[PDB]
Amino acid sequence: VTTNQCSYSGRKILPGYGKRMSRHDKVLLIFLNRKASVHYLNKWNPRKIRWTLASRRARGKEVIV
Amino acid sequence: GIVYEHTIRLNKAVRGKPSKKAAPIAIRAIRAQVEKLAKVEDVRLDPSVNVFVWSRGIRHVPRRIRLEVRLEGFAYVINKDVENFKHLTTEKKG
Amino acid sequence: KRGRSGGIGNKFRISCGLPVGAVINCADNSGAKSLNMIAVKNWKGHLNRFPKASVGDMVLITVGRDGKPELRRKVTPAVVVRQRKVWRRKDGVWIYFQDNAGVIINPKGELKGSSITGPVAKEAADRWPKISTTAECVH
Amino acid sequence: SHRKFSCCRKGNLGYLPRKRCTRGRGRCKTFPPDVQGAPIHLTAFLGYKAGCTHVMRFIDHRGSNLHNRQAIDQATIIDAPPMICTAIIGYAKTPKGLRAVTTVWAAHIAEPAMRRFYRNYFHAEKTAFSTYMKKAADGTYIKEQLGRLKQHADVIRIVAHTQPALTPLKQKKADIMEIQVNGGANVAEKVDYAYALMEKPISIKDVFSVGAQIDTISITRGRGFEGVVTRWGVTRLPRKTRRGNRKVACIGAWHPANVQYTVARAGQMGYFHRTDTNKQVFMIDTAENPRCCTTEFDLTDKSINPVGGFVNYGRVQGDFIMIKGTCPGPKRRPVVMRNALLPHRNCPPVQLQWISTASKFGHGIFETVEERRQFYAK
RNA sequence: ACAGGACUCCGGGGUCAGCAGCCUCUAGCGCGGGAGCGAACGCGGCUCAGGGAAGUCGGCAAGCCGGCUCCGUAACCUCGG
RNA sequence: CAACGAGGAUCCCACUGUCCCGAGCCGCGCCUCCGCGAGCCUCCAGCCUCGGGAACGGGCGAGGGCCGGCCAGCGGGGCAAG
RNA sequence: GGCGCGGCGCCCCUGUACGGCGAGGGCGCGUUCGCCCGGGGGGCGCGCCGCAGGCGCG
Ligand SMILES: [K+]
Ligand SMILES: [K+]
Ligand SMILES: [K+]
Ligand SMILES: [K+]
Ligand SMILES: [K+]
Ligand SMILES: [K+]
Ligand SMILES: [K+]
Ligand SMILES: [K+]
Ligand SMILES: [K+]
Ligand SMILES: [K+]
Ligand SMILES: [K+]
Ligand SMILES: [K+]
Ligand SMILES: [K+]
Ligand SMILES: [K+]
Ligand SMILES: [K+]
Ligand SMILES: [K+]
Ligand SMILES: [K+]
Ligand SMILES: [K+]
Ligand SMILES: [K+]
Ligand SMILES: [K+]
Ligand SMILES: [K+]
Ligand SMILES: [K+]
Ligand SMILES: [K+]
Ligand SMILES: [K+]
Ligand SMILES: [Mg+2]
Ligand SMILES: [Mg+2]
Ligand SMILES: [Mg+2]
Ligand SMILES: [Mg+2]
Ligand SMILES: [Mg+2]
Ligand SMILES: [Mg+2]
Ligand SMILES: [Mg+2]
Ligand SMILES: [Mg+2]
Ligand SMILES: [Mg+2]
Ligand SMILES: [Mg+2]
C-alpha cells in the first residue's frame, strides 16, 4: 500500500495513521505520532534524538545512498 | 522437613493500594502467599525479611523478593539474597 | 434570472474550532489585520450553545482597531481558510495549520482583496472557486 | 409560570428502566418475516466480539462527494466457529399467540451441550437425557415426532449450540440458541431441511453473505452506580453551589406532590440489552487461510490475527465475519447476528483495497513480524 | 472534660539576604482503635485539545507576574514624588 | 487637588475550566466488617384522582391501585423541625 | 470455573544501562564525547509450560 515518510524521524507511515501539519511558508509535514510532533514543536535536534534515521545516519549506523 | 524456594513480585501485590501503606500490605501479602504455598496455618517471618521489605521506606518497595521457606514443627520464612532473578522459579527439597 | 448563492455544492461535517468571540488573522490584502467573529451563517442554535464555525464556512466579522478606519464600524461577511483545531477528512487524513485565518468575501462570491497569503484548505477552495483561483497553495 | 426559554428534555424514555439486564445474554426477540415461495435459508448466528481495525475501500457511490475516491472505514471483527444443530422446535399461531407443539432432540449430544445443563460438571452426577438416548436409539421415534410437527406446526426453528473449545474463551459449556428456518415452498420442506441439518455443523458463511446487512444484539459495557451528569447528560450547576454541582437542581413542582418518572436520577449505568441495526458485511472468511486479509494491492501475506494478538481477546483460529462500524459490548461478549428486518436502501457495494494488521498493543508500525525483524536485523 | 485561651529564659548544621521556606545533629517521641473495598456524591488537591469573560448582579474563584544583574522608563506634581 | 486606600464604579492588555461542554486522576470520608455507641422528633397513622368542606384531605362520599420485610441514594410531599 | 503463583517467547513503552577502552576546553586532574549498545530497564496484552489446583453445610 502507498505509505508516507515521517518528516521528523525516517520511519514509514501506514494508511490511516498520524497527522499532517501545514507550515505558513507553504510546506507540509507528515508525522508518525504525537511523540514526533512534540519533538518537532519543542525544536529538539533530530541528530541528537538517538532513535531517528538522521541520528543513525550521522552515527554511521545507516547508509546515505 | 521440606525446604521451598520461591520469588514473590511485590510491586504487583501493592497494586491498587495507597502508596503510604505499601510495606505493611506487602507484609500481609507475603504471609498469605506463603500460607497458600506451604499449606500451613501459621507463618513465622524473619527480621531479615522485614529489613529487606522496608529497606526503601514505606512507599517505594522493591519489585521482587526471594524467600526460603522451611516447613516444620508452622512455616518459617527467611530472606535469600540473590541477583536479577533471571529464569528462577519454585524449588523444592526434602 | 441568475441570482445564485455562494457555497458551491455539499460539504461534509468537520470539527469546528472557532466560536463566537474569537479573533483571527486577515489573510487577504484589504487593509484589515484582525477580524472579530460575531456570528455564523446558517446557524440554528440551542439553549446556551455558542455558534461555531469551521473552514469553508461564511461568518460575520468586525474589523479591529489595528485595521483601516474606512473598513471599521460595520458587519462584514468573510470565509475562514485556515484553522488550528485538527480535523479528519473522509479519506482518513488528520490535518491542522499554525494560525487561524479568513478572507473578506460577499455571498455573491467576490473577494474584496487581490491576493491570499499562505496556504488555504481544500474545503474553502472547493466551496468558493474564486478562492480556489487566487490562492497560491492548497492543502 | 412557564419555562421562559424553549429546550427539549434529556434522554429517551423508551429505554426504561435503566436496570441491569436479567436475560443472561442477548436474546433475539423477533425473527425476519417468512415469505411463501422464497428459497430456504437460515437467519441467525452467534459469535464473540474479537476486535476492531480499519480498512481502505474504493467508494462507488453516485451523486456523493466520495464518488470516485477512496475512504478509510472502521470495521469490527467477530469470531464465529461453526455451530452444531441438535434439536427441532415447531410452533403454531393460536388465538393466544405462538404456542409450541413439541421439541425433538438428537440421538447423541455433545459435551458442551451436556455441560450447559449443569452447574458444576465434575461433581454433579450425570442423568440428563439418560432415558432419551435409550428410547431414541432407533430412529423410528424421531420419525413419528417429526411426523407430528409436519402434520401441524406453523413455524420451524432449529436449536443449535456454539463450541467454545475452538476459542480463547474461558467457559466450557455452550451457548444454545434457536435459528428459525424461513422460506421454502411449505412447512414440510422446512421440516425435511431441519432433519437434514440434525447433528451437523453449520458455518456462518452459509447464513450470511457479503455486502448484505445484519442486526447485532448484545449487552453493553457496565459502569455500576453513576450520577445524573453521566447517566442522563443533564447540565452541571455553577461552581459556587454550596453542596455539589453534579445534580438536578429541581426535581418537581409542589403539585403534583410526588416525584415523576420523567425526572433524572442516579443509579445503575451500563450493562443493558441493546440492538443496533443495518450493519453491512465487509467479509466472511477463515483464519486457516493465510491469504485471508491480503489484497492485490500488497504482495506480502497477511491474515486476520494482528501482530501481538487481539488485545484483551485472544487468538482467532477459525471462521470470522467482518462488519462496517461498531457493535455493543466489550471484547468477548457473545453477539447475536440476524438478518436486517428493515435494511437501509442505498449502500454502495464493498470493494476492499487494504486491511490494517499492525499491532494494537501500543502504536505498532509493522504489518508483519517478518518485516519487523528485517527492519531490526542485527 | 476540649484543634480555643495562657507571661518569660537558653537557641547547633546545610542552602540562603535571612529567627523566611525546605532537609537535618542533640533531645523527645500520642493523636476517643483497627482491617477490607476501590460505587455515586462530597471535602482538600492535579492536569486538560480548539476558543478566550461569550459565564455572572459583578472576572467571584482560579490563573498570569515574582529572586539577582544590566538596559530602559511617560502624563502629572505640594519638586519630596 | 500630588501622594495614599483589604473603600464605590467604567474600560484595555495579559491570563485563564467562568463558560461553550465537560473528561480523566490522587488522598480522606462515605460503603462492608471486628470493637464502642448517642441527639432531634413523635394525636393516631403513613398510595392516589375528583367532589364537598373553616373555600389546597392520609382518614369523609365516589372511583383507581397495592403480598410482606429491607439496603444504597434522594430531596416532591408530610402546609417536616427549630 | 481443579483457580492461581512463578517463569520462558513474542509484542509494545522509554530512549542507548553499569563498566571497560579510546576523543575533550584547558591546567596527574577534567564537565562532556565515541564504541561495545535501537542497548538496559519495565509490562496489568498475546502464546507455551517448576510449584500447584475438585470445600463444609443443607
Ligand atoms: K482552531
Ligand atoms: K418558571
Ligand atoms: K424558570
Ligand atoms: K442539571
Ligand atoms: K412534584
Ligand atoms: K424519576
Ligand atoms: K430531570
Ligand atoms: K439523583
Ligand atoms: K435497543
Ligand atoms: K466500597
Ligand atoms: K448519588
Ligand atoms: K464578563
Ligand atoms: K447569557
Ligand atoms: K478574582
Ligand atoms: K513582569
Ligand atoms: K506630591
Ligand atoms: K485609607
Ligand atoms: K480601605
Ligand atoms: K464605599
Ligand atoms: K467526570
Ligand atoms: K369545595
Ligand atoms: K379538595
Ligand atoms: K422533602
Ligand atoms: K400537599
Ligand atoms: Mg443560559
Ligand atoms: Mg457554607
Ligand atoms: Mg491500542
Ligand atoms: Mg457578559
Ligand atoms: Mg489605614
Ligand atoms: Mg470535553
Ligand atoms: Mg395530615
Ligand atoms: Mg372513604
Ligand atoms: Mg421544597
Ligand atoms: Mg553507551
Mutant choice from D55, D59, D72 vs C, greatest count of C C-beta within 10 A = D72
For residue B81 the three cell numbers come to 539474597
- CB atoms C92 and D6 under 8 Å: no
CA of D180 from ligand 17 middle (Å) equals 90
Between positions 102 and 131 of C, the ones with CB within 8 A of A are: 118-119
Give, in order, the Cα–Cα distances in Å from C47 to each of A47, D1, D9, D247: 53, 19, 12, 19
User: What SS3 state is found at B16?
Assistant: coil
Cα separation, B4 vs B1, whole angstroms? 10
For residue D37 the three cell numbers come to 415461495
Q: What totals of helices (H) and strands (E) does chain D contain, helices first?
A: 6, 15
For residue D202 the three cell numbers come to 453449520
Q: Note whether A56 and A12 are within 8 A (CB).
A: no
Nucleic strand F near CB of residue D242 (< 7 Å): no
Closest nt to residue C49, judged CA to C1': F20
Q: Note whether D318 and D16 are within 8 A (CB).
A: no
Q: How far is C12 from chain A (nearest CA, A)?
A: 18
Closest ligand to residue D249's CA: 4
Cα separation, C79 vs B22, whole angstroms? 59
Residues 315-334 of D near strand G (Cβ < 7 Å)? 315
- CB atoms D354 and A11 under 8 Å: no
CA of D162 from ligand 24 middle (Å) equals 58
- CA D297, chain centre distance (Å): 31
Handedness of CA D30, D31, D32, D33 (dihedral sign): negative
Strands C23-26 and C101-104: parallel
The enclosing H or E element of C24 equals strand C23-26
CA of B16 from ligand 20 middle (Å) equals 20
Q: Note whether A40 and A31 are within 8 A (CB).
A: yes
| Contact of chains B and C by CB distance (3 or more pairs under 8 angstroms) | no
For residue D284 the three cell numbers come to 466472511
Cα separation, C55 vs A62, whole angstroms? 42
Give, in order, the Cα–Cα distances in Å from D306 to each of C49, D22, D55, D317: 43, 35, 14, 12
Cα separation, A40 vs A44, whole angstroms? 6
**Is D126 annotated as contributing to ligand binding?**
no
- How big is chain D, counted in residues? 378
Question: Cell 426535581 sits at which residue?
Answer: D251
Cα separation, D82 vs D98, whole angstroms? 29
D235 in contact with C, Cβ within 8 Å: yes
Q: How far is A7 from chain C (nearest CA, A)?
A: 15
Q: Which chain D residues are closer than 8 Å to A15 by Cβ?
A: 56, 72, 354, 356
Closest ligand to residue D256's CA: 5
User: What SS3 state is found at B10?
Assistant: helix
Cα separation, D174 vs D83, whole angstroms? 10
Strand partners, D71: D57
Residue D242 CA and nucleotide E2 C1' are separated, in Å, by: 29
Q: Note whether D171 and D163 are within 8 A (CB).
A: no
Cα separation, C62 vs D359, whole angstroms? 50
D7 in contact with C, Cβ within 8 Å: yes
Nucleic strand G near CB of residue D125 (< 7 Å): no
User: What SS3 state is found at B4?
Assistant: strand
Give the type of residue at D287: A
Name the residue among D7, D56, D65 with its Cβ closest to that of C12. D65
Name the residue among D54, D298, D353 with its Cβ closest to that of A16. D54
Largest CA distance in chain B: 40
- CB atoms C91 and D69 under 8 Å: yes
Which method resolved this structure?
Answer: cryo-EM
Cα separation, D172 vs D115, whole angstroms? 7
Q: Is D29 exposed, middle or buried (0-12, 13-18, 19+ CB in 10 A)?
A: exposed
Cα separation, D198 vs D81, whole angstroms? 18
Q: Note whether D300 and D371 are within 8 A (CB).
A: yes
Q: Note whether D84 and D166 are within 8 A (CB).
A: no
Give, in order, the Cα–Cα distances in Å from C24 to each of B13, C78, D281: 54, 11, 45
User: What SS3 state is found at B5?
Assistant: strand
Name the residue among A15, A19, A22 with its Cβ closest to that of C119. A22
Q: Note whether D224 and D31 are within 8 A (CB).
A: no
Which strand E bases fall within 7 angstroms of a protein CB? Answer: 35-43, 49-55, 58, 60-61
Strands A12-13 and C52-53: unpaired
Strands A12-13 and A19-23: unpaired
Buried b (16+ CB within 10 A) or exposed e, A16-52: bbbbbbbeeeeeeebbbbeebbebbeeeeebeeeeeb
Buried b (16+ CB within 10 A) or exposed e, B26-38: beebbbebbeebb
Question: Cell 476492499 sits at which residue?
Answer: D352
The upper half-sphere exposure of residue D205, i.e. CA atoms within 13 Å in the direction of its Cβ, equals 8
E strands present in chain D: 41-42, 44-58, 70-79, 83-94, 97-105, 155-161, 176-182, 201-202, 213-219, 222-226, 267-270, 273-286, 319-324, 334-339, 352-355
Cα separation, C18 vs C43, whole angstroms? 14
